[PDB]
Write a protein that binds this ligand. Structure first.
Ligand code: HEM
Ligand code: HEM
Ligand SMILES: C[C@]12CCCC(=O)C1=Nc1c(nc(N)[nH]c1=O)N2
Ligand SMILES: C[C@]12CCCC(=O)C1=Nc1c(nc(N)[nH]c1=O)N2
Ligand SMILES: NC(=[NH2+])NCCC[C@H](N)C(=O)O
Ligand SMILES: NC(=[NH2+])NCCC[C@H](N)C(=O)O
Ligand SMILES: [Zn+2]
Lengths: 405, 405
């Protein structure tokens, strides 16, 4: 057979070979002796040049111009600029291309059928933390679009030789606060405890509800961060209710429309963009299963099961399962009622299968992280569970990065 | 270097140091992770010696006897045997230890808390298919123990130089037939279509039902397989009813009490046991999710959802998730009403956590395959979902092997 990964789908009985992985420059955490695929985070000179050269080639390739004069001219111009300034800049449409690509390359994202439709806001002119606030507000305005959501990314200035990074401290543009108590517990979203304490430490006046939208903490080159509160009318939220369980409404649960990861470094041709928030729309299970049922988040399963009158003294009643289905249902219903874009884990995964097939044709593979693509309820009930997948790092990429503090 | 392994629910980190013991390579390389592939792409005297020395040192260590008189004379035995015949033989108590350690090392198995309680039948004195059938019959009889299930393995003669393997052609000792219909579709378990055909092709007259217990095809070295029908009364079956929905029963669904895998190979101290069928008891989801709801299995979701009165027409109604849940519920009710051992997915993954904990203290880790340990439903609702796991091959070991035909 071909010596590239044989990938099988056990439901359809079909084979593909992933030849795309051959392009991976970067290595991940597995070795022949032990597989580390399940861990969340696995433990410049002439280097820049070859990262840069490869990205330009991806670009010129994508516009079908490999070998052309614009192409070799562009390669020369890049290495003249690394030659003298130790770095280089990207043309506008080179940035747009690379941003989209990073998304298309992201092994953990199930929504990639949408990769070619992303609005890229150049913000490489940004000079202050004030300015960052304006762009972010603008992004949120555009992306939200009164509930009819549009995928977008804003790109702030890249990293530079001996000059401090641009950083958004928050992990998402929109996050609920988590307050620590002496009684040990956490009010709000326990994931956000640290960023909450940090905002207070930098001079925020805390609320004290389960659902207080956090202020942004925005950092500009070689400065302490600055505090910024989102105008509430910009932050669209969805109150949660059940289509038939009248009391669910009374739990006073809510969620925000816009998922906007603000802490991930965007790497393109070796240039590093530390502040480059992107947003899409949610998949039902992110809110409904992880955010609301993780034992270390809102952990509402028990509350709800009691309301449903389930027997929670025993695992074999599948009370945890019954409550979960009904919560997910409520998330979906409430967004549909509110006319805010959402996608259920079935439709979502069905579209990823379509994505897998498009990429097979186009690139000869699609890097994908199974543990992360399979939804956290109803896994085997969805087609991706039966689909083997190869994971590998391609560049451009979205990458995790150490916290500014 | 040893992997930091984090639990995300509890914030606890640990370090897996056992994996340094692993001698066999897996399918992953630093360039791409093949963690989710089911089977290997792949699938001497000096080397067997070393696998055997390593195993014997293991066995004496296990009984607190390293460097004892017994230990050294046993190594010298093996020495002499191999040096002469190109091979050697295990003592019964070594086998017993080996079988146990093989289950202990099995990364895809969530029942390993049970690893020390295994009844081991030595069947290495078997010269025909007939005898195999009598051994297979005692195993079932004992394992089943009228519903109070008990874990067993039955080890037939090891492979040898230049003669056929003892093999059980069936993938489990109890499986339902799959009959192809002229119109392409399959009546009964579609994963068993091949094994069904082979049985008709060696003289078995088929049933015409969804739930026909297949015969056994048993092969002694270099003979045509022979066919044997299991006695109806040795094969315990549960009919499927549901606690509250009366029509469910009418649906006629049944399943069998004994999960007895028969197509895998047991490797101990480099000896290979080509027929070593083992059984424990079922986890509910194996049946109620996979075997009944996989689209390429009995595929019953839509039938139920229809009976359940649900909006079949759109994915947003979560009809699948809803039906899946009842179906698992009914498997659990039905087994418990028949006083036949079953473990649910919540209880099982809770006990798998304890196991991981016991093995941390005992060995410095636990080879575990995340994608196989997380149930097919309610993933993030069990504690394993949140537990990083390192996967790798330790010996003794169950391995897959080619089909004999
Ligand atoms: C358009 C609608 C979209 C849907 C339904 C979608 C779906 C998802 C889901 C379910 C995850 C895993 C989330 C988790 O469990 O934490 C994910 C992760 C990711 N997505 Fe997408 N996505 C979409 C748009 C986008 C866009 C526009 C980008 C970037 C341009 C993106 C890039 C990523 C990245 C980088 C991750 C991994 C983040 C991490 O490792 O924590 N997503 N997305
Ligand atoms: C005590 C009752 C047991 C329970 C509840 C249990 C649970 C499981 C489950 C859910 C799987 C995944 C199975 C699948 O989806 O096909 C599994 C796999 C496995 N189990 Fe256990 N198990 C038990 C006993 C045992 C015993 C006694 C052995 C060997 C002596 C064993 C060896 C394995 C092996 C080799 C696999 C790999 C399956 C494969 O590759 O097909 N299990 N077990
Ligand atoms: C289950 C696992 C990987 C193992 C550890 C963990 O907590 C995870 N977390 C996430 C995951 N997948 C997604 N989409 N999101 C997670 O947070 N997969
Ligand atoms: C989903 C995956 C791994 C990927 C390929 C596949 O079809 C699987 N099959 C099984 C699995 N886990 C279990 N327990 N059993 C499977 O058959 N995990
Ligand atoms: N659909 C997305 N873009 N998700 C991005 C990750 C958001 C994060 N999982 C959340 O629930 O807020
Ligand atoms: N509980 C076990 N040890 N099972 C072995 C696998 C059985 C297989 N999953 C089945 O449904 O028949
Ligand atoms: Zn791996």
């Amino acid at each position: 057979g071909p010596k590239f990964p044989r990938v099988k789908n056990w439901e359809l009985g079909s084979i593909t070979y992933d030849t795309l992985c051959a392009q991976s420059q970067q290595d991940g955490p597995c070795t022949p002796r032990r597989c580390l695929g399940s861990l969340v985070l696995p433990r410049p000179a002439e280097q820049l040049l070859s990262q840069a050269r490869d990205f330009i080639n991806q670009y010129y390739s994508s516009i079908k111009r490999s070998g052309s004069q614009a192409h070799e001219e562009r390669l020369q111009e890049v290495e003249a600029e690394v030659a003298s300034t130790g770095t280089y800049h990207l043309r506008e449409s080179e940035l747009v291309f690379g941003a989209k690509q990073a998304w298309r390359n992201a092994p953990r994202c199930v929504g990639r059928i949408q990769w070619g439709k992303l609005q890229v806001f150049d913000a490489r002119d940004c000079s202050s933390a004030q300015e960052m606030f304006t762009y972010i507000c603008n992004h949120i305005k555009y992306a939200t679009n009164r509930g009819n959501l549009r995928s977008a990314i804003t790109v702030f200035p890249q990293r530079a030789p001996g000059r401090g990074d641009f950083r958004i401290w928050n992990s998402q543009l929109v996050r609920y606060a988590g307050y620590r108590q002496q009684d040990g517990s956490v009010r709000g979203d326990p994931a956000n405890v640290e960023i909450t304490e940090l905002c207070i430490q930098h001079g925020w006046t805390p609320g004290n509800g389960r659902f207080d939208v956090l202020p942004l903490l925005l950092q500009a080159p070689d400065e302490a961060p600055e505090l910024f509160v989102l105008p509430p009318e910009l932050v669209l939220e969805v109150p949660l209710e059940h289509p038939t369980l009248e009391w669910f409404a009374a739990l006073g649960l809510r969620w925000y429309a816009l998922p906007a990861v603000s802490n991930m470094l965007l790497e393109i041709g070796g240039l590093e963009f530390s502040a480059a928030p992107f947003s899409g729309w949610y998949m039902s299970t992110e809110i409904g299963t992880r955010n609301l049922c993780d034992p270390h988040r809102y952990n509402i399963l028990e509350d709800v099961a009691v309301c449903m009158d389930l027997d929670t003294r025993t695992t074999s009643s599948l009370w945890k399962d019954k409550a979960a289905v009904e919560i997910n249902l409520a998330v979906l219903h409430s967004f549909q009622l509110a006319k805010v874009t959402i996608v259920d884990h079935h439709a979502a995964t069905v579209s990823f299968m379509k994505h897998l097939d498009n990429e097979q044709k186009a690139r000869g593979g699609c890097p994908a992280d199974w543990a992360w693509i399979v939804p956290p309820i109803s896994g085997s009930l969805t087609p991706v569970f039966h689909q083997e997948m190869v994971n590998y790092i391609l560049s451009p990429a979205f990458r995790y990065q150490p916290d500014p503090w």
